[PDB]
């Protein structure tokens, strides 16, 4: 322990959340979760003070769903401090610079180091965000205004880590990453259905919310048949078919989320402890969706930055050609969903490649994650040996072999299945999209599975 010791004085200077005196009941853990997400939601509606012009094209638009970010607000960075600092912690632990340990004083030191790097990432990303050209020109903005925006994003990033740690310490129902990602996705879907925002294009005033539009169209046009057709088949604004597609995808993903292989196990050390070890089809809950989205979104940012500066280069053009900003050629084009059914017909190769990439990457990410997160059959077999658990119909030596048959298939096929559901949601035009809806369903199921876990104990 050499790296954690030198930064130890700098770790304790940040606020920490008190460990609960006793376990909080699930009733009040939901309430603190609701309070935590309410604070995050309020912070993501309050714009930064120093913004001069939010008119330029947004540079990080593709991570906004997976970073729980909102451009130009206090939640501009979103959960980026949590994701990046946690990544540095895993990379440092994986490469043996630091040790996570098990001593309560060592775990607190590990938490303090993660919080310290979250501030470093928050400050580093705040400067990068300012210099990207958003909020206006930094030279015209001024040193004081640019510094003030960094201060606002620094305290906001401190709040996110404080809110994230609040959920982890035992007051909430999980992590800030899962809660804040799902909260924005659920907020977006409800907004597309109930927003009172109205837009006029000449024909009249039309509500942006699909359900509000249906009631407005029926009343204004006196139960017109065309009003129902417009409410369901609206291309300019969200329509009811996209909402029905959203509900259909929710139902289908929920059905496959409940798929599980139930291993009948007994304990050999302490006899009488019998139970079921479930191997879910979605073995990796939503990591393949996050890993795929992060890979494509990060690749999009790199492609646009290289296209703007080093335009004309063959390698830059191969990485992606951009024409709002959407890919039209290069590698980034084949990683984007088809625009419409006509787009599939005119370019059948891109639709096939996108489906193959979406299924292949999610299947590959899922099977790779189990070899990193510690859910590989060898690591699960070791946990069985540590707890003395064996499978009913199999010998004590044949625990890893049976796990080798189920877990690698569950990860690879589960990632492929969760990759296909995102395509189906995208191809059906579901409000929420493929990544967002699948993220929302899987995160909510993690909260439901906590409820049944606490209920089963009682």
């Amino acid at each position: 322990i050499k790296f954690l010791e030198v930064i130890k004085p700098f770790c304790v200077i940040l606020p920490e959340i008190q460990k609960p005196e006793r376990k909080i009941q699930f009733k009040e853990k939901v309430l603190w979760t609701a309070i935590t997400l309410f604070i995050f939601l309020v912070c993501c509606q309050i714009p930064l003070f120093g913004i001069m012009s939010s008119d330029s094209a947004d540079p990080f638009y593709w991570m906004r769903v997976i970073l729980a970010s909102n451009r130009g607000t206090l939640m501009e960075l979103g959960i980026s401090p949590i994701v990046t600092s946690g990544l540095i912690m895993q990379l440092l632990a994986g490469a043996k610079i630091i040790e996570v340990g098990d001593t309560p004083k060592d775990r607190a030191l590990f938490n303090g180091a993660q919080k310290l790097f979250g501030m470093i990432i928050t400050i580093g990303q705040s400067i990068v965000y300012v210099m990207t050209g958003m909020y206006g020109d930094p030279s015209e903005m001024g040193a004081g205004i640019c510094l003030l925006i960094t201060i606002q994003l620094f305290v906001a990033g401190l709040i996110v880590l404080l809110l994230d740690e609040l959920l982890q310490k035992g007051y909430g129902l999980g992590s800030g990453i899962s809660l804040f990602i799902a909260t924005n996705i659920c907020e977006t879907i409800v907004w597309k259905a109930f927003s009172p925002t109205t837009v006029n294009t000449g024909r009249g005033m039309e509500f942006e919310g699909a359900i509000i539009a249906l009631f407005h169209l029926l009343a204004t046009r006196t139960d017109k048949v065309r009003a129902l057709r417009e409410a369901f088949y609206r291309q300019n604004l969200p329509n009811l078919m996209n909402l029905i597609a959203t509900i259909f995808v929710f139902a289908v993903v929920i059905y496959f989320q409940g798929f599980r292989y139930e291993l009948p196990i007994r304990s050999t050390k302490v006899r009488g402890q019998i139970g079921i070890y479930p191997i879910k089809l979605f073995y990796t809950s939503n990591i393949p969706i996050i890993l795929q989205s992060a890979l494509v979104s990060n690749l999009y940012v790199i492609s646009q930055m290289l296209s703007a500066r080093f335009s004309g280069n063959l390698l830059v053009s191969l990485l992606g050609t951009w024409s709002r900003a959407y890919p039209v050629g290069g590698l980034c084009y084949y990683l984007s969903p088809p625009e419409s059914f006509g787009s599939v017909l005119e370019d059948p190769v891109h639709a096939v490649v996108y489906i193959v990439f979406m299924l292949g990457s999610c299947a590959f990410f899922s099977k790779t994650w189990i070899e990193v997160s510690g859910s590989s059959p060898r690591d699960i077999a070791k946990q069985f040996k540590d707890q003395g658990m064996v499978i009913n119909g199999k010998r004590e030596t044949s625990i890893y072999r049976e796990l080798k048959k189920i877990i690698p298939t569950a990860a690879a096929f589960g990632g492929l299945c969760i990759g296909a559901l995102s395509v189906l949601a995208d191809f059906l035009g579901a409000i929420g999209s493929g990544t967002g809806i699948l993220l929302a369903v899987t995160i909510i199921y993690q909260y439901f599975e906590i409820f049944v876990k606490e209920q089963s104990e009682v």
Binding site: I66, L67, S80, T84, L87, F117, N298
Partner: peptide
């Protein structure tokens, strides 16, 4: 996304 996660870039240190």
């Amino acid at each position: 996304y996660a870039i240190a």
